[PDB]
Structure 1
Amino acid sequence: SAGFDRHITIFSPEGRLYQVEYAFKAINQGGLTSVAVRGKDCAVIVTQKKVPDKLLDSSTVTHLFKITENIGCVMTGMTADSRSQVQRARYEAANWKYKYGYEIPVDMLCKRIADISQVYTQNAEMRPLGCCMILIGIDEEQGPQVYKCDPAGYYCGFKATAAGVKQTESTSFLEKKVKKKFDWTFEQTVETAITCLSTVLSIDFKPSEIEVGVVTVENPKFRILTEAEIDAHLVALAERD
Structure 2
Amino acid sequence: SAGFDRHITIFSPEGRLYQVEYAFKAINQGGLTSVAVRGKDCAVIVTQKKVPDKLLDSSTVTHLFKITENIGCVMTGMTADSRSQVQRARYEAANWKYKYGYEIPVDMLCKRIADISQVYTQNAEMRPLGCCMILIGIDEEQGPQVYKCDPAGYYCGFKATAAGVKQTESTSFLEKKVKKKFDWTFEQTVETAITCLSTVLSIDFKPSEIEVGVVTVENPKFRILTEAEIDAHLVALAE
Query: With structure 1 as the length reference, what TM-score do the two structures score?
Result: 0.96
Q: Which moved more, 1:81-90 or 1:181-190?
A: 181-190
- Tell me: CA distance 1:91–1:182, structure 2 relative to 1, closer, same or farther (3 Å): farther
Count of matched residue positions in the alignment of Structure 1 and Structure 2: 239
1:45 counterpart SS class:
strand
Tell me the distance in 2 between the aligned counterparts of 1:69 and 1:8.
40
Question: CA offsets per residue over residues 54-99 of structure 1, 9 Å max, x none?
Answer: 1111100011000101001010010111101011101010111111
Match of 1:220 in 2: 220
Alpha-carbon distance between aligned partners in 1 of 2:204 and 2:180, rounded to the nearest angstrom: 24
State how far apart, in whole Å, the 2-side matches of 1:105 and 1:29 are.
Answer: 31
Corresponding residue SS for 2:146: strand
Go from structure 1 to structure 2 and tell me whether the alpha carbon gap of 1:218 and 1:200 turns closer, same or farther (over 3 Å shift).
same
Whole-Å separation in 2 of the counterparts to 1:188 and 1:168: 22
User: Which SS does the other structure have where 1:84 is aligned?
Assistant: helix
TM-score, normalised by the number of residues in structure 2: 0.96
Q: 1:225 to 1:8 in 2, by over 3 A?
A: farther
> Equivalents in 2 of 1:156, 1:134: separation in Å?
10
Residue 67 of structure 2: SS of its match in structure 1? Answer: strand
Query: Contact 2:9–2:18 at 8 Å: present in 1 too?
Result: no
Task: State the Cα distance separating 1:198 from its structure 2 match.
Answer: 2.0
CA drift at 1:125: 2.1
Contact 1:4 1:18 in 2 (8 A): no
My pick for the range that moved more, 173-182 or 1-10, is 1-10
Alpha-carbon distance change, 92 to 8 in structure 1, aligned in 2, over 3 angstroms: farther
**C-alpha distance 91-198 of structure 1, shift in aligned 2 (>3 A):** same
Structure with the larger helix share: 1
Give 1:226 deviation, angstroms. 1.1
SS in 1 for 2:4: helix
Is the partner of 1:203 in helix, strand or coil? coil
Q: SS state of the match for residue 133, structure 2?
A: strand
Which residue does 1:107 correspond to in 2?
A: 107
Equivalent pair of 1:31/1:164 in contact (CA under 8 Å): yes
8 A contact 1:44–1:190 mirrored in 2: yes
Question: What SS does structure 2 have at the residue aligned with 1:81?
Answer: helix
Hey, what's the Cα distance between the residues in 1 that align with 2:168 and 2:139? 28
Q: Shift in Å at residue 22 of structure 1?
A: 0.9
User: Matches of 1:8 and 1:190 in 2, distance apart?
Assistant: 43
SS at match of 2:199: helix
Do the aligned partners of residues 5 and 18 (structure 1) sit closer, same or farther apart at CA in structure 2, a change above 3 Å counting? farther
Query: Over residues 101-129 of structure 1, what are the superposed CA-to-partner deviations in whole Å (9 max), with x where a residue is unaligned?
Result: 11111111011101111111111121110
Divergent runs of 4+, >4 A: none
SS of alignment partner, residue 145 of structure 2: strand
Q: For the residues of structure 2 that align with 1:187 and 1:73, how far apart are their CA atoms?
A: 21
Q: What RMSD in Å do the two structures reach over aligned CA positions?
A: 1.2
8 A Cα contact 2:68 2:93, kept in partner: yes
Q: Which runs of 5+ in 1 are unaligned?
A: none
Q: In structure 2, what is the Cα distance between the partners aligned to 1:156 and 1:101? A: 26
Shift in alpha-carbon separation, 1:173–1:115, aligned structure 2, 3 A: same
Overall identity of the aligned pairs, in %: 100
Q: Residues 2 and 101 from structure 1, CA distance in 2 versus in 1: closer, same or farther, beyond 3 angstroms?
A: farther
- 1:198 to 1:114, Cα distance in 2 relative to 1, 3 A: same
CA distance in 2, matches of 1:134, 1:2: 36
Quote how far apart the aligned CAs of 1:194 are: 0.9
Give the secondary-structure state (helix, strand or coil) at the position aligned to 1:138: strand
